[PDB]
């Protein structure tokens, strides 16, 4: 009696949700769709792939889309040895825990603030004296509160033995740049830290780029075990086309361009980490010094074939793809107060911006953009639209915190800040808001960071600035531009 | 040849699926949208924010919807002092670490099963004689297998120094309730223990509210660490028009009606945990006593602004809107056989349900809704409609983890309960399925309780059942309601 | 030899699993799972799924 | 008590089968059929008879 009740219990406010039902919940409806495959295929770099060089590949044309694309990376195990055993005892120098400059850098603000006779002072002296000095730096600074020496001195417990490993999330610090290029123009750039800053934002839950990237969330112990032994790594490669089947790069339309990846890698000494100064790196099956000829990579392809109606419709008519390109503002940092101009084009969908201390880089911690200590590097941000607020000054837990909540799949563990125009910036088919920053006169980003941020051993830190805009792609007679 | 021969092996039962297919997945379609802009505008009480008092702001009109709301809480850093040190002394009391009263209730339940003189013990002897009669009492009332006593003995290793903190979860704490009023008429209510339980069941991976609300998953340490300096907490208020953006508040089509946000803010005394009994909370920055006058607090609204065109159709025709609102029934329990009338009305989705002992809101553990000894403290529970089960007797697993499978984000880390009427509770533009309570003479959720829930120590534990209910919005000629 | 490995220090081999100094059985891991060697759904004597 | 049966003599109830006095395994009685649990006939992926 009462379920058939409420049946019958409508009125005419029901009416605007109910009458005319278009959709039950008890029974399906299904769509028939066209007959496709998917196939991956790994394929060499048509140039040589070396630390420190820009290599090339021209990607094939096994199927009549492009879907999936990853930058497979192949890198040796390592081991170490002491320089006075070593037969060619000349390397390029790595970053060494012996030689900690982010500590030193740290230790270098507090000075002042180190009470009694620091330079004759025994070691287990000298840390009490300087954690002493952080709390009465930390109270003067920001009005913080101490906390009990005890609980700064937390002894990372690192091995007794010598050991070498890749640097945190080397997958994607080996990419410093990547372009993808379509008869010979440039149509999207990827950056290191704009892949990183990506997948802090962006990376879903359970779906974390960890293993395919070699990131242990700076678990020292776990880089070491997997620098051991060979890895092969799997990074994706997030242009527009590898984010909806509906934007796959339509191969067949582009018959008259060559498709082409380029990547500038990093550096081999910013890869390692070694835990003494005076150790050579050597690769681990080969017993031979590390050199720049030791990194191999392969591009993996996922290629769509079509049925041939599809196919033939596809050649005759692909049309328009609305796409996302990325664009960089870098700038060096050498006072608190930072004002970044902004000269970015298109309607920009959203922007993402985050500091790297001098010390972090130096230390090969690529991806730690913490302030001093630890800190968030930034107190406050304002945004300027010709000289007038389009954001008034926020601080850095609201373009860090919620931003990332209102916006994103994911709040970043770092010190990540975004600020989106777009209300769904993750939709890569449906655009949901823009500004149009080739109609600005000025775009500024202006900065309130941390105290003696970018001073003495920080100077020349690093903002990173990278905007993500709406571009249109056009194919016309195997054409694409 | 194999994969032509898929294409032209189709029949019948394709043709319901892929017959005049009308998508592809090898070209993107995009729609095109309106001209829209997003502001974030940060803006002060129009009474003074205090602890234990209640507050209000009018919302500024500076945009033609509103989105986003936050409430921006700004709490100062903590440091402690000797009362026997301090030339003012006299301050609330505060829970403290020194005087457990949740381990003393839990150890007053174990006192008939400790064997031998517990008086005159020794404190290991009497640690010792606690674990053994706990093994005694959980095998004569749950036929449980005794744990080893060197388990039972958990250290949590607390610091050997003076400290207090803001209590877990803080920025919902703090938020007793909240009203959103139109007009002057209350449109939502929400409360502290409701905001809890909505992050925990739709609190999405990588998004949970942690940083944002000041939530250590209960590790009293960061906790600790957190409140030695000044926290901003922004805690997001989940009224109907922040779910979806084709719900968002429509400031044009209310331009006679004011906009309020109501808080009744959380005790002071209920918001510190400190380590021992005889401490003094003082403002880290300020060295003076806390006190009611030390929370600060604003409301940061993102603004939607519309082209011309779209704000002059919305002003002429807002129509109606879809609304979620939220019911409360509260009460007190003295027994372990507990029946809560739910005088709730309306096409209810769902509701949750959990139990606080008192001994855990005393203890300043104001989100731990375990039993006695962190056990589950449902046994079971029923659901009736007219004296008819709607939902026959099932396990508490049944309601905290099957219902939350079935229809929630997320499992609850805490012993919260749910049962949804809706498919898709979580949908806030597409109706699943309701309840009408307003149609039904009596809803009655019956409770059997863990043994000794609500006894003794814990006489006045709390029973909480929210339940979310469907309402309609409606716009006309500048009003809401 | 197998895998051209370097050699981990054999302290960092030595995991203990600190296992309890008392006598215990336990049901196996994901037993629900376990448990279910197979499940088939029939509809008029007809297996639909398994 | 149960059938109104009238009783046996005893020593017409006590039937010792002649068990050998060794040790022995065998296959249960009609293993054949014991062992096909369940057939099922399918043609096309259909079952036809079970």
Same mark, same amino acid.
């Given at each position: 009696? +009462? ?5 019958? !219990? ?7 949700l109910?009458?005319?039902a278009t959709?039950?919940?008890w ?13 991956s ?16 590949? /021209? $990607? ?14 192949? #890198? ?11 037969? @060619?005892?000349? @390397? ?6 012996d030689?900690? $400059? ?13 009470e +009694?006779?620091? /330079?004759?002072?025994? #070691?287990?002296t ?12 930390e ?6 509160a ?20 890749w640097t ?8 410093k740049? !990547?372009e993808?290029?379509?008869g010979?123009?440039t149509?999207?750039?990827? %950056? ?19 293993? /395919?990237?070699g ?12 620098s ?26 582009a ?6 990846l ?13 835990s ?11 017993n031979?010094?590390?050199?720049d000829?030791?990194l191999?990579?392969?591009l993996?392809?996922?290629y ?10 596809l050649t ?10 990325h664009?960089?503002?870098? @700038?060096?940092?050498?006072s608190?107060? $930072? ?17 790297r ?13 913490? +302030? ?8 406050? !941000?304002?945004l ?12 850095? $837990?609201? %373009? ?5 909540? @209102?916006?994103?799949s ?11 125009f ?17 109609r ?14 970018? !001073? ?24 694409? +531009?």
């Open positions: 009696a +009462g379920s058939l009740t409420q049946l019958l !219990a409508t009125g005419s406010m029901d009416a605007a109910t009458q005319n959709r039950t919940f029974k399906s409806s299904y769509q028939k769709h066209s007959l496709f495959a998917l196939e295929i790994n394929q060499p770099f048509t140039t040589q792939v070396q630390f420190g060089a820009e290599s090339h590949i /021209t $990607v094939n044309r096994q199927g009549d889309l492009l879907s999936w694309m990853y930058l497979k990376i192949v #890198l040796p195990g390592l081991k170490v040895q002491n320089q006075a055993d070593t037969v @060619q005892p000349t @390397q390029q120098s790595f970053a060494s825990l030689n900690d $400059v982010a500590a030193q850098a740290d230790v270098s603000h507090v000075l002042p603030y180190i +009694g006779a620091y /330079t004759e002072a025994s #070691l287990n000298k840390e009490q004296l300087i954690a002493e000095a952080k709390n009465s730096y109270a003067a600074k920001y009005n913080a101490p906390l009990p020496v005890a609980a700064q001195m937390q002894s990372t417990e690192m091995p007794d033995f010598d050991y070498a490993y945190e999330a080397i997958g994607f610090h080996l990419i740049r !990547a993808f290029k379509v010979g123009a149509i999207d750039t990827i %950056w290191s830290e704009l892949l990183f800053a990506m997948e802090e934002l962006m990376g879903r839950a359970g779906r974390r780029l960890t293993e /395919t990237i990131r242990t969330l700076r678990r020292p112990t776990e880089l070491m075990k997997a051991r032994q060979e890895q092969i790594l799997y990074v994706p490669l997030p242009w527009y086309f590898t984010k909806h089947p509906s934007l796959a790069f339509p191969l067949v339309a018959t008259y361009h060559n498709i082409q380029w990547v500038q890698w990093a550096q081999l000494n910013s890869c390692i980490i070694k003494r100064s005076n150790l050579v790196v050597l690769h681990a099956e080969r031979v010094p590390i050199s000829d030791h191999r990579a392969s993996e392809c996922t769509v074939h079509l049925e041939a109606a599809e196919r033939d419709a005759a008519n692909a049309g328009t793809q609305l796409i996302v390109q664009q960089a503002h870098l @700038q060096q940092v050498s608190n107060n $930072v004002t970044a101009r902004l000269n970015f084009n298109f309607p920009v969908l959203e922007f993402y911006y985050f500091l201390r001098k010390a972090n880089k130096d230390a090969g911690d690529h991806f730690n953009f913490s +302030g001093i200590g630890g800190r968030d590097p930034v107190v406050s !941000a304002e300027l639209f010709n000289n007038t607020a389009r954001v008034t000054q926020k601080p850095a $837990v609201w %373009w860090r915190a919620v931003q990332a909540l @209102q916006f994103h994911s709040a970043p563990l770092t010190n990540i800040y975004s600020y989106s777009s209300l769904s910036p993750e939709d890569p088919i449906t655009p949901s808001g823009s500004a149009n920053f080739s600005l006169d000025s775009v500024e980003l202006a900065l309130t960071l941390q105290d003696d941020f970018g !001073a003495a051993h920080d100077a020349n830190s690093e903002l990173f600035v990278f905007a993500r805009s709406y571009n249109i792609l056009k194919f016309t007679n195997g054409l694409a +531009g």
